[PDB]
Write a protein that binds this ligand. Structure first.
Ligand SMILES: *[C@@H]1O[C@H](CO[C@@H]2O[C@@H](C)[C@@H](O)[C@@H](O)[C@@H]2O)[C@@H](O[C@@H]2O[C@H](CO)[C@H](O)[C@H](O[C@]3(C(=O)O)C[C@H](O)[C@@H](NC(C)=O)[C@H]([C@H](O)[C@H](O)CO)O3)[C@H]2O)[C@H](O)[C@H]1NC(C)=O
Ligand SMILES: *[C@@H]1O[C@H](CO[C@@H]2O[C@@H](C)[C@@H](O)[C@@H](O)[C@@H]2O)[C@@H](O[C@@H]2O[C@H](CO)[C@H](O)[C@H](O[C@]3(C(=O)O)C[C@H](O)[C@@H](NC(C)=O)[C@H]([C@H](O)[C@H](O)CO)O3)[C@H]2O)[C@H](O)[C@H]1NC(C)=O
Ligand SMILES: *[C@@H]1O[C@H](CO)[C@@H](O[C@@H]2O[C@H](CO)[C@H](O)[C@H](O[C@]3(C(=O)O)C[C@H](O)[C@@H](NC(C)=O)[C@H]([C@H](O)[C@H](O)CO)O3)[C@H]2O)[C@H](O)[C@H]1NC(C)=O
Ligand SMILES: *[C@@H]1O[C@H](CO)[C@@H](O[C@@H]2O[C@H](CO)[C@H](O)[C@H](O[C@]3(C(=O)O)C[C@H](O)[C@@H](NC(C)=O)[C@H]([C@H](O)[C@H](O)CO)O3)[C@H]2O)[C@H](O)[C@H]1NC(C)=O
Ligand SMILES: *[C@@H]1O[C@H](CO)[C@@H](O[C@@H]2O[C@H](CO)[C@H](O)[C@H](O)[C@H]2O)[C@H](O)[C@H]1NC(C)=O
Ligand SMILES: *[C@@H]1O[C@H](CO)[C@@H](O)[C@H](O)[C@H]1NC(C)=O
Ligand SMILES: *[C@@H]1O[C@H](CO)[C@@H](O)[C@H](O)[C@H]1NC(C)=O
Ligand SMILES: *[C@@H]1O[C@H](CO)[C@@H](O)[C@H](O)[C@H]1NC(C)=O
Lengths: 141, 274, 141, 277
């Protein structure tokens, strides 16, 4: 269903909500375990984001949980609706090729923010970037 | 109204059983039901007969009989259960589309009514239902998600509890759509303008969805202006900003026009040069 | 000298700021280690809070760190200023008679909130409550 | 101006050393310096002599000589270092009080100037300084915390680096006080009011200060009314609000409502008029 509206989709307002969510979080040394794409196996910027975008979905549901009707909770919902819209921009075929992490919640938030931010950057340059077959890229894993 | 024999609301049979549904009216009648194999159909003037020798789980569902040519006649119905020990679900559709705040029926038909006490709705890959998912179940129809939301646009599965293990139906994709009233809301300002040979014209459009175009055109020749795009207050904005640091060739009829799947909308102004 | 304004000092605004801070935090399973008063050794409500109030000072400095000029950061500062004012309600003694905990950040925040909340409650009943010698209470540890 | 011999800005001596400070002007002169032991004083008409046989680390500090009979004549100063290998610090005061946004000098005198390259200010029990603590050090005076804040009201310690180990001074308590400008800020509304007898009216007396220690009462004429005040902390300020509700007004309710609030500074007052038609 991919379209020229793959850009204009990740607004700055989205990134602000993420930043505010990040800024609200208490700086603590505690680490949380989560599944995410390994930068080593995927040096390719375009195929890294492709694999990451899929994983961010599970992260926001499982990890990024907030009290109902709180500003952060609403921000998360919007980011999730955003991700549904970002679907049909990413072409995909057949898991794995990923690694377990053990980082602070703030570091997790920075990863997710980076995923959304860099995806916006690339789509501004060209909205049809993430429609490439990374099956070959997903082989070297 | 036509008459179905047997006069029973529902039937429960094993795979392999013989099922024979007969309908009778005054005028010609016809059956409708699940698209399923092994059905034989016998029909004459006033009656019609569905029959199979090898009933399968796919035959599970409501079979409705109507008498065409009788208007306001009404219909008669009967529900068939084929309790396949291996196949608890007969999914009628793997795709469902609704709008927000509508009920969303996921048509997975249970092949054995006694299983109802141990059924549930889940997402693919074992994930749980989205938070605050209001839903209920009917054996004849399937799971209905009440007041569906855009966020619930997911791939679902129907869970049946058989011998301890939960057995899944094939996936069912649900599409929930934002109710988009019409074309993108335009704001072209200023409505009137007149300058001596600076000026600014901003063409803007906003919709809850991102999938919409907007263009600013001088006369009928559209201008190539890079549009600024941002998301705020749960709405997408797309703004074309024209900056003329002016002359007689810039004057004219600037039309601000935006389109989407709904249709095209247009607003305009006049620019004079003295 | 312990004032009659030992009450009116912990305002509801203070408790709201704490609540907003708690509500802003991401719900995660990660645990953090910290020192806090043991309810077992101190069942006495008045002497529990006394020992707790001293300990929350280090907690807010060490654990409850937020980004500069963020709403939560400002809230912590106010709670810290509040605690300085509260010193003149708590009469001095002398460590120990406390134990190490290993709980989620939200649980830690609930403890601190409970300390501030119950202290306000008691001071409303009587503003001169925490002027009692708990040296005898601190013995059974 | 009086004259000190030796004519040197400072001295550095070992514990046990003999130190002799002599001052001379025309007329009586006087020494002032750290309250310290073993000082002997010889004085006469135009001269005065401080002297010790057992100089100790407590003798560390500035010794100032003045001629009390000369007005505007000025003073002369000399600084003494007694470099005790065990005692790097001579603390003059264990308590310091200032107001917010003032410099706060913590008077820990370094007993050996070469140690400066490796001194620091810390808090008791090993605690680090508060965040964004702007401070500097002078050997003759001690650590000065610049633009002190209420949050910095803590027990401090002076750290000296000697043979790897950090050696602590005795604790120094700093009190930073909020600058309370004047009486509580009043807001009495409405400024004007007129109702028909039987109708309703509301008068809210309010006062706010950075400190909690302040009173506020609303009075009809000069007879104060008994209104329960709601008290809350908001926008980093304490509020105390008297809310008067008359659901059933009448002619005797009309009059000179004065809203007046007090504190240790003084009392502030504002007022309005109420008419009954
Ligand atoms: C009752 O129905 C059986 C199923 O018929 C199929 O299934 C229904 C739901 C419809 O889709 C219909 O169009 C299909 O034909 C009758 O067929 C026999 O049933 C078994 C399952 O119970 C199986 O389907 C048999 O077919 C094969 C097949 O798929 O072609 C025969 C193959 O030889 C065999 N595999 C190989 C390589 O030998 C496969 C496999 O065993 C299965 O695919 C995997 O287990 O099965 C089919 O002949 C059945 O005859 C009928 N009973 C009556 C009329 O009494
Ligand atoms: C130079 O001065 C030394 C100290 O004079 C005393 O200390 C100063 C700070 C003032 O308080 C002053 O009023 C005092 O007279 C002379 O003697 C010895 O020096 C040390 C150095 O710090 C110390 O002050 C001595 O007192 C102690 C000690 O520390 O040795 C104090 C101890 O508590 C005590 N017991 C111990 C060490 O556990 C010891 C002795 O053991 C006592 O006998 C206890 O039974 O004394 C202080 O006497 C020094 O003599 C002088 N020099 C010359 C050349 O005169
Ligand atoms: C800036 O440019 C636009 C585009 O040229 C102007 O719009 C035109 O204005 C006309 C006003 O009379 C019409 O609205 C016209 O629309 C049509 C149409 O849809 O076809 C034009 C047709 O020529 C006309 N048909 C006839 C027989 O006259 C038709 C007609 O009114 C309807 O069918 C009757 O219901 O309307 C439209 O293209 C702007 O006006 C111009 N200036 C400004 C200030 O906006
Ligand atoms: C009845 O309400 C009125 C206002 O509606 C109050 O008026 C003012 O109250 C103040 C206390 O809150 C002062 O008392 C003030 O006193 C004056 C005065 O009464 O004349 C104000 C004058 O401006 C001043 N003289 C000048 C320089 O013009 C005058 C003078 O300095 C000395 O105070 C006189 O001894 O003081 C007053 O206007 C009333 O307080 C309140 N109650 C009563 C009983 O009137
Ligand atoms: C879930 O959808 C229900 C639609 O039938 C809706 O029904 C109401 O249920 C309430 C309890 O949740 C209450 O008892 C009402 O009288 C009844 O109409 C229900 O409100 C929906 N649930 C939520 C949480 O909105
Ligand atoms: C059946 O249909 C015929 C033709 O419309 C009509 O004449 C007749 O009355 C009907 N009989 C019944 C029992 O409905
Ligand atoms: C005495 O002091 C006066 C100050 O007025 C000065 O002029 C004079 O020289 C002094 N004389 C002596 C002997 O110090
Ligand atoms: C620290 O002191 C210097 C002295 O000029 C000042 O410039 C600086 O702003 C102060 N505080 C900060 C901002 O850290």
């Amino acid at each position: 269903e991919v379209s020229e509206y793959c850009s204009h989709m990740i607004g700055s307002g989205h990134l602000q909500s993420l930043q505010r969510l990040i800024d609200s979080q208490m700086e603590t040394s505690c680490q949380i375990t989560f599944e995410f794409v390994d930068q080593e196996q995927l040096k390719d910027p375009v195929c890294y984001l492709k694999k990451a975008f899929l994983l961010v979905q599970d992260i926001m549901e499982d990890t990024m949980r907030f009290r109902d009707n709180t500003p952060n909770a609403i921000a998360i919902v919007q980011l999730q609706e955003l991700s549904l819209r970002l679907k049909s921009c990413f072409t995909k075929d057949y898991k794995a090729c990923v690694r377990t992490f053990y980082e602070t919640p703030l570091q997790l938030l920075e990863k997710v923010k980076n995923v959304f931010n860099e995806t916006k950057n690339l789509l501004d340059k060209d909205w049809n970037i993430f429609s490439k077959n990374c099956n070959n890229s997903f082989a070297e894993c | 109204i036509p008459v179905i024999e047997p006069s029973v609301p529902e039937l429960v049979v094993k795979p392999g059983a013989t099922v024979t549904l007969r309908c009778v009216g005054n005028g010609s009648v016809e059956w409708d039901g699940p698209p399923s194999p092994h059905w034989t159909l016998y029909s004459d003037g006033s009656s019609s007969i569905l029959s199979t020798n090898n009933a399968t789980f796919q035959n599970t569902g409501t079979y409705r009989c109507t008498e065409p040519g009788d208007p306001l006649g009404g219909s008669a119905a009967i529900h068939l259960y084929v309790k396949d020990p291996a196949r608890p679900w007969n999914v009628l559709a793997q795709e469902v589309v609704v709008f927000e705040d509508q009920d969303a029926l996921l048509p997975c038909l249970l092949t054995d009514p006694v299983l109802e006490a141990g059924v549930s709705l889940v997402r693919v890959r074992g994930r749980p239902l989205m938070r605050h998912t209001n839903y209920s179940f009917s054996p004849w129809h399937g799971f209905t998600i009440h007041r569906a939301k855009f966020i619930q646009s997911q791939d679902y599965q129907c869970s049946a509890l058989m011998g301890g293990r939960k057995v899944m139906s094939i996936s069912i994709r649900l599409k929930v759509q934002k109710v988009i009233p019409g074309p993108p809301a335009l704001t072209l300002v200023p409505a009137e303008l007149v300058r001596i040979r600076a000026a600014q014209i901003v063409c803007s459009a906003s919709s809850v969805d991102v999938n919409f175009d907007v263009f600013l055109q001088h006369q009928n020749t559209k201008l190539a202006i890079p549009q600024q795009s941002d998301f705020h207050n749960n709405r997408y904005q797309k703004v074309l900003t024209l900056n003329l640091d002016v002359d007689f060739q810039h004057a004219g009829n600037y039309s601000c026009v935006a389109s989407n799947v709904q249709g095209k909308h247009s607003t305009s102004m006049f620019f004079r040069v003295v």
